[PDB]
Amino acid sequence: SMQAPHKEHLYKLLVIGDLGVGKTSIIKRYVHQNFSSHYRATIGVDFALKVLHWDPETVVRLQLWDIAGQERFGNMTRVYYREAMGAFIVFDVTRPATFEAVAKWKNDLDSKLSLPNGKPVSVVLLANKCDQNGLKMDQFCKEHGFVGWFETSAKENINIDEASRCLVKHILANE
Ligand SMILES: Nc1nc2c(ncn2[C@@H]2O[C@H](COP(=O)(O)OP(=O)(O)OP(=O)(O)O)[C@@H](O)[C@H]2O)c(=O)[nH]1
Ligand SMILES: [Br-]
Ligand SMILES: [Br-]
Ligand SMILES: [Br-]
Ligand SMILES: [Mg+2]
Task: Answer yes or no: are the C-beta atoms of 153 and 161 closer than 8 Å.
Answer: no
Torsions phi, psi of 85, nearest 5? -105, -5
**Cβ-Cβ contacts under 8 Å for 29 (sequence gap 6 or more):** 35, 154, 157, 160
Pocket of ligand 1 (CB under 6 A): 17, 19-25, 37, 39-42, 68-69, 128-129, 131-132, 153-155
Determine the distance separating the centroid of ligand 1 and the alpha carbon of 72, expressed in angstroms: 18
- Name the DSSP letter for residue 4: P
Protein residue with its CA nearest to atom 26 in ligand 1? 39
Long-range pairs for 91-97: beta carbons < 8 A, 24 or more residues apart = 91/17, 91/18, 91/21, 91/125, 91/126, 91/127, 91/128, 92/20, 92/21, 92/22, 92/128, 92/129, 93/127, 93/128, 93/129, 93/130, 93/132, 93/151, 94/129, 94/132, 95/20, 95/21, 97/18
Q: Nearest CA to 41 among 68, 61, 64, 11?
A: 68
Determine the distance separating the centroid of ligand 1 and the alpha carbon of 25, expressed in angstroms: 5
Write the single-letter amino acid at 144.
H
Measured from the CA of 38, which atom of ligand 1 is nearest? 27
Q: Nearest CA to 95 among 138, 139, 127, 142?
A: 127
Write the single-letter amino acid at 47.
F
Determine the distance separating the centroid of ligand 2 and the alpha carbon of 36, expressed in angstroms: 7
Give the dihedral of Cα atoms 113, 74, 88, 63; nearest 10 deg.
Answer: 80
Task: Answer yes or no: are the C-beta atoms of 49 and 63 closer than 8 Å.
Answer: yes
Write the single-letter amino acid at 108.
D
Interatomic CA distance for residues 127 and 60, integer angstroms: 25
List the end-to-end C-alpha distance of the chain, in Å, as a whole number.
30
Number of H helices, E strands in the chain: 5, 6
Q: Is 106 marked as binding a ligand?
A: no
Q: Is 152 marked as binding a ligand?
A: no
Q: Which residues pair with 148 in a beta bridge?
A: 124
Q: Which chain residues have CB less than 5 Å from ligand 2, an ion?
A: 38
Interatomic CA distance for residues 122 and 86, integer angstroms: 5
Stated in angstroms to one decimal place, the resolution of this structure is: 2.0
**Cβ-Cβ contacts under 8 Å for 20 (sequence gap 6 or more):** 39, 41, 69, 92, 95, 98
In this structure, the chain runs to a length of 175
DSSP string, 37-104: S------SEEEEEEEEEEETTEEEEEEEEEE-TTGGGSS-HHHHHTTEEEEEEEEETT-HHHHHHHHH
Q: Nearest CA to 16 among 137, 104, 95?
A: 104
